[PDB]
Amino acid sequence: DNSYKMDYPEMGLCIIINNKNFHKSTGMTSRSGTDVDAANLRETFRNLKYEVRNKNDLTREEIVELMRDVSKEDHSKRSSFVCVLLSHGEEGIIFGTNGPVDLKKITNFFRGDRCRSLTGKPKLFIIQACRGTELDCGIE
């Protein structure tokens, strides 16, 4: 066998964290049009048979809180896990409405020893966020 077993009772969960409005004090500007992405992703993963859950404008605390809980759930009858992060960010960092969260932190909740229900199953993280401030000028 060389391909992931996708015949489990269910394709799995698809968590979409869509942050559009940040606290004034963070200095972070609103991410317009992000609702279009979240609506699109929701419809696409629905037809792929994933149980989708949209969460909007979560604080750093809630983001971690959500990941912690999603990991403690039982994924025995689920084939895979998908997490989509739509927000501001920097290298290895994604912004909660009230402040930054380092990726590694929420990623660890799903690694081998931690989320044994997903062990051996594909954990996919789709991230729409900045990774710094460099601009690509292109060529030709």
Binding site: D37, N40, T44, L48, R111, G112, D113, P122, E134, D136
Partner: protein
Amino acid sequence: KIPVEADFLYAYSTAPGYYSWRNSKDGSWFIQSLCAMLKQYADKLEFMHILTRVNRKVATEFESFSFDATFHAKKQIPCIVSMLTKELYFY
């Protein structure tokens, strides 16, 4: 026994250290290009190949426009980071 960091896939919208583009009415370049390729190919291609399609689309069909010279005519390339152990098919 297998690595704890294994079976992970990070599909980033942009390359390491770079900005990422989002359009106010159309959505981010990455997401609208990802959903389009999933719809057309989820039932035909392996996942690593689909994302590659998404790379070509974002890289090819998008270019920023702005009155601010510093941000005008900028390109973007998504970054796939795989630590998967097998091929992934949604069917």
